[PDB]
Amino acid sequence: GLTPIHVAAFMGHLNIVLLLLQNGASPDVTNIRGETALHMAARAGQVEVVRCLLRNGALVDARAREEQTPLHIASRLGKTEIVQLLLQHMAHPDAATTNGYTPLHISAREGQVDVASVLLEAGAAHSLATKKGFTPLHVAAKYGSLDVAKLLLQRRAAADSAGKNGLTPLHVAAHYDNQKVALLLLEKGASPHATAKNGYTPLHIAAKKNQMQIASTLLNYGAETNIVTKQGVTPLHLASQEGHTDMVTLLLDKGANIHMSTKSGLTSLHLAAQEDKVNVADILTKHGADQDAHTKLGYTPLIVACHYGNVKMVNFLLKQGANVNAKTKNGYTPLHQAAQQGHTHIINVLLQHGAKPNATTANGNTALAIAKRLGYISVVDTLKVVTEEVTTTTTTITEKHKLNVPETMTEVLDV
Incomplete structure (x- = not known):
């Protein structure tokens, strides 16, 4: 009006x-x-x-x-x-909008370095936090405002200020893939060890996103490889799940422990098995990964690969000597898991490598019986030739197929 x-x-x-x-x-x-x-x-x-x-x-x-x-x-x-x-x-100079942005925050978001220089010379506070904990340096890291970040750090803005979830500007720059800002922060003294509330370090983020230059520099400034999130996840877990072979090799070269497992028992080799990362699995194998490590429920990498239908990982693990007759804690073998998920092509490979078709779960079921109840006619037709007949009755104990799945890793950075 x-x-x-x-x-x-x-x-x-x-x-x-x-x-x-x-x-x-x-x-x-x-x-x-x-x-x-x-x-x-x-x-x-x-x-x-x-x-x-x-x-x-x-x-x-x-x-x-x-x-x-x-x-x-x-x-x-x-x-x-x-x-x-x-x-x-x-x-x-420090007036704040309702969301806590100062003019300095705004200038970092829009990359207005001449405005930020005027504000800083006029006495603006260089490290005030928004409602969510972001300082102007966090904003520059999110929007890749390199020239503003250079000015902030020259005025001794706090490189390690942590937002609400514990994220430092370095976390933010790595997460948003603003690699020049990340490298600047480290060169200007940002801690390579800072941990978010859930335990993520910058190395976790770099490893997950295959940021080779950032990971190298973190390791050069002393970052640890064998630190865990609150779920037990290491940078090597993340690199392995994503298939980042050069990152996996860098972390191992720099001391990562190949045997570390998450809270639920998942090793890096389980995660390569889940994601069909055969080149990763080879590197992990050459570094001594246990081909029959068990999760908390008893899943080996081979049973994991059978669940997800990853035949290249199945073939690779069998050639490294993985046990084709391994059992989970409730008696599932690779054959049972492949049968439950309908994976006829995996059934045929497992039978060729000596999987036992009459193996029964704790509840007494063969792989054939599980596939039969679930209607995987192709699996049934394959196992029919090689499995002893059993009569199904209404009193037959059946499996809880939705529970009989391998553990997964779902933890992520908290932004």
Whole structure:
């Protein structure tokens, strides 16, 4: 709901602004958004109008929607000369919007390095946190504002400030793949060891995203390879699950322990088995991974690969000597797991490698019986030739097929 001074100011009609003020118009009337003529002059870049309104007594820090001052607006649009004028008229450099963004946060988000330089020289606090804990350095790390991040760190902004979930700017830069900012933070002294609330380090993130240069530099600054999240996950687990062979090799080269398992018993080799990462599995095997490590429920990598139907991983694990007749704690063999999931092609490989078709689970079922109850006619037709007949009765104990699945790793970085 505009008044005449709002219109004149937005349009930059300096003659009309003076005419209105000369006749007693108040510079502080607001429109429906709570904006004054100064908000609108700033948004439109009207440097001379801004100077005239300030010199004629306008409220410098009038608050509009989201508690925005004219300084927030000028900073967002990179109106350096208007930022300077507002600060010279006592605009508070640390004024915060309702979400906690200061003009410095805004300049880091928009990559306005000239505005950030003016704010920092005028005394803006360089490390105030938003509601979620983000400092301007966190924002620069999320939006890849390298030149603003350089300025912040030159003014000794805190490189290790941690948000609500414990994320440091280095976490944020790695997560958002802003690799120059990550490398700058480390060179300027950011800790390579910082842990989020769930235990993620920057090395975990680098390992998961195959950020080879970041991982190398972290390791050069002393980062540990054998640290765990709250679920027991290591950087090597993450690299292995994703198939990042060069990352797996780098972490092993730098001391990673190939035998570490998660909370539920998953080793790196289980995760390669889950994701069919045969080249990873080869490297892990050459570094001594136990081909028959068991999860908490008793899944070996081979039974895991049978569950997910990963025949290349099945063939690879069999050639390394994995036990084709291994049993989970409730008696599932590779054959039972493949039967339950309908994987006829895996059934045929397992039978060729000596899987025992009459093996029974703890409840007494063969693989044939499990596939039969679940309607995998192709599996039944294959196992029929090689399995002893059993009669199914209504009293037959059947398996809990939804429970009889391998453990999985679902933990992720908390952003």
